[PDB]
């Protein structure tokens, strides 16, 4: 590519352990799954929406966030892969797909966070402007 623009991100989840297993639904944790820029920037300048695909056991498993912060807070008992799909304002830009294993146990606070880079190769002039 003649122009390469790299936007570093971090993604993953935090989990907060209840005293013990909740009687009503057996949930043990509140958790937040998220994507955020690696350093201070407003991704919403160039991100259209971020989808979070949860386990089939959630009644509403496809969650969508269009305004920062790009995060979903839920309760649960299970650890499973969440698919994070980042769509851009430029329809010419392929979405970014991330995969994250939700982590609840290592203990009152658990953080599972990873680094990645969204790489834009020869974007349109309009997307290059939004990115820079």
From Swiss-Prot:
Localization annotation: Nucleus
Outcome (variant: residue 27 to A): Impaired binding to histone H3 succinylated at 'Lys-122' (H3K122succ)
Sites marked Interacts with diacetylated histone H3: 57
Name recorded for this polypeptide: YEATS domain-containing protein 4
GO biological process, one term: chromatin remodeling
Parent-protein start and end of this portion: 19 to 156 of 227
GO terms, molecular function: histone binding; histone H3K18ac reader activity; histone H3K27ac reader activity; structural constituent of cytoskeleton
Subunit structure: Component of numerous complexes with chromatin remodeling and histone acetyltransferase activity. Component of the NuA4 histone acetyltransferase complex which contains the catalytic subunit KAT5/TIP60 and the subunits EP400, TRRAP/PAF400, BRD8/SMAP, EPC1, DMAP1/DNMAP1, RUVBL1/TIP49, RUVBL2, ING3, actin, ACTL6A/BAF53A, MORF4L1/MRG15, MORF4L2/MRGX, MRGBP, YEATS4/GAS41, VPS72/YL1 and MEAF6. The NuA4 complex interacts with MYC and the adenovirus E1A protein.
GO cellular component labels: NuA4 histone acetyltransferase complex; nuclear matrix; nuclear membrane; nucleoplasm; nucleosome; nucleus
Domain notes: The YEATS domain specifically recognizes and binds acylated histones, with a preference for histone H3 diacetylated at 'Lys-14' and 'Lys-27' (H3K14ac and H3K27ac).
Taxonomic placement: Eukaryota, Metazoa, Chordata, Craniata, Vertebrata
Organism for this UniProt entry: Homo sapiens (Human)
Entry comment describing in which tissues the protein is expressed: Expressed in brain, heart, kidney, liver, lung, pancreas, placenta and skeletal muscle.
YEATS domain sequence ranges: 3-132
Annotated keywords: Chromatin regulator, Coiled coil, Growth regulation, Isopeptide bond, Nucleus, Transcription, Transcription regulation, Ubl conjugation
Region named Diacetylated histone H3 binding: 77-81
Cross-link (Glycyl lysine isopeptide (Lys-Gly) (interchain with G-Cter in SUMO2)): 21
